Amino acid sequence: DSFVIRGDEVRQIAPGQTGNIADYNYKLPDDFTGCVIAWNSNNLDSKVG
Amino acid sequence: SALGKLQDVVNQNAQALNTLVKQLSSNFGAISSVLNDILSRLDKVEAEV
Protein backbone atom coordinates (compact mmCIF):
# COMPACT_ATOMS: atom_id res chain seq x y z
CA ASP A 1 0.00 0.00 0.00
CA SER A 2 1.33 3.48 -0.93
CA PHE A 3 0.56 7.17 -0.12
CA VAL A 4 2.08 10.58 0.88
CA ILE A 5 1.55 12.24 4.33
CA ARG A 6 3.43 14.96 6.29
CA GLY A 7 6.46 13.58 8.26
CA ASP A 8 4.68 14.05 11.66
CA GLU A 9 1.85 11.64 10.67
CA VAL A 10 4.13 8.53 10.24
CA ARG A 11 3.41 7.64 13.94
CA GLN A 12 -0.32 7.25 13.05
CA ILE A 13 0.75 4.54 10.51
CA ALA A 14 1.03 1.71 13.08
CA PRO A 15 -1.34 -1.10 14.28
CA GLY A 16 -4.06 0.02 16.76
CA GLN A 17 -3.44 3.80 16.27
CA THR A 18 -5.95 6.72 16.30
CA GLY A 19 -5.86 10.29 14.85
CA ASN A 20 -7.30 11.75 11.60
CA ILE A 21 -5.06 9.71 9.22
CA ALA A 22 -5.58 6.40 11.08
CA ASP A 23 -9.28 7.32 11.70
CA TYR A 24 -10.31 8.61 8.22
CA ASN A 25 -7.59 7.78 5.62
CA TYR A 26 -5.64 4.52 6.32
CA LYS A 27 -6.59 2.22 9.26
CA LEU A 28 -4.15 -0.65 9.99
CA PRO A 29 -5.59 -3.70 11.88
CA ASP A 30 -4.36 -4.58 15.42
CA ASP A 31 -3.08 -8.03 14.25
CA PHE A 32 -1.07 -6.53 11.33
CA THR A 33 1.78 -8.76 10.07
CA GLY A 34 3.91 -6.47 7.91
CA CYS A 35 6.32 -3.53 7.65
CA VAL A 36 5.81 0.27 7.50
CA ILE A 37 8.52 1.95 5.41
CA ALA A 38 8.64 5.77 5.31
CA TRP A 39 10.96 8.48 3.89
CA ASN A 40 11.15 12.25 3.41
CA SER A 41 10.34 13.46 -0.17
CA ASN A 42 10.67 17.29 0.18
CA ASN A 43 13.08 17.23 -2.84
CA LEU A 44 10.40 15.40 -4.97
CA ASP A 45 6.79 16.13 -3.81
CA SER A 46 7.07 19.77 -2.55
CA LYS A 47 6.68 22.70 -5.02
CA VAL A 48 7.13 26.54 -5.04
CA GLY A 49 3.92 28.19 -3.69
CA SER B 1 -20.58 -23.83 69.97
CA ALA B 2 -21.78 -27.48 70.32
CA LEU B 3 -22.39 -27.53 66.48
CA GLY B 4 -18.85 -26.13 65.88
CA LYS B 5 -17.92 -28.61 63.08
CA LEU B 6 -21.01 -27.70 60.96
CA GLN B 7 -20.79 -23.93 61.60
CA ASP B 8 -17.05 -23.96 60.70
CA VAL B 9 -17.91 -25.72 57.37
CA VAL B 10 -20.42 -22.89 56.65
CA ASN B 11 -17.98 -20.12 57.71
CA GLN B 12 -15.11 -21.46 55.52
CA ASN B 13 -17.29 -21.45 52.36
CA ALA B 14 -18.53 -17.90 53.15
CA GLN B 15 -14.90 -16.77 53.84
CA ALA B 16 -13.73 -18.34 50.54
CA LEU B 17 -16.46 -16.59 48.47
CA ASN B 18 -15.96 -13.18 50.16
CA THR B 19 -12.21 -13.55 49.40
CA LEU B 20 -12.96 -14.54 45.76
CA VAL B 21 -15.23 -11.45 45.36
CA LYS B 22 -12.86 -9.03 47.22
CA GLN B 23 -10.08 -10.00 44.77
CA LEU B 24 -12.05 -8.18 42.00
CA SER B 25 -11.07 -4.89 43.77
CA SER B 26 -7.27 -5.63 43.42
CA ASN B 27 -4.98 -4.03 40.76
CA PHE B 28 -2.49 -6.93 40.06
CA GLY B 29 -0.09 -4.21 38.76
CA ALA B 30 -2.69 -2.68 36.35
CA ILE B 31 -3.40 1.12 36.24
CA SER B 32 -6.88 0.59 37.83
CA SER B 33 -8.91 -2.40 39.11
CA VAL B 34 -12.05 -1.14 37.25
CA LEU B 35 -12.18 -2.68 33.76
CA ASN B 36 -14.25 0.08 32.04
CA ASP B 37 -11.87 2.65 33.66
CA ILE B 38 -8.78 1.09 31.93
CA LEU B 39 -10.79 1.20 28.65
CA SER B 40 -11.38 4.98 29.25
CA ARG B 41 -7.84 6.13 30.36
CA LEU B 42 -5.90 4.46 27.51
CA ASP B 43 -5.94 3.76 23.74
CA LYS B 44 -6.30 0.17 22.38
CA VAL B 45 -2.80 -1.43 22.63
CA GLU B 46 -1.97 0.32 25.95
CA ALA B 47 -5.39 -0.68 27.41
CA GLU B 48 -4.91 -4.31 26.20
CA VAL B 49 -1.54 -4.59 28.05
Curated annotation (Swiss-Prot), chain B:
Changing residue 40 to A: In strain: Alpha/B.1.1.7. Changing residue 27 to K: In strain: Omicron/BA.1, Omicron/BA.2, Omicron/BA.2.12.1, Omicron/BA.2.75, Omicron/BA.4, Omicron/BA.5, Omicron/BQ.1.1, Omicron/XBB.1.5, Omicron/EG.5.1. Residues 7-49 form a coiled coil. Subunit of the fusion protein that is processed upon entry into the host cell. Mediates fusion of the virion and cellular membranes by functioning as a class I viral fusion protein. Contains a viral fusion peptide that is unmasked after S2 cleavage. This cleavage can occur at the cell membrane by host TMPRSS2 or during endocytosis by host CSTL. In either case, this triggers an extensive and irreversible conformational change that leads to fusion of the viral envelope with the cellular cytoplasmic membrane, releasing viral genomic RNA into the host cell cytoplasm. The lineage of its organism: Viruses, Riboviria, Orthornavirae, Pisuviricota, Pisoniviricetes. The chain holds residues 943 to 991 of 1273 of the full protein. This is Spike protein S2'.
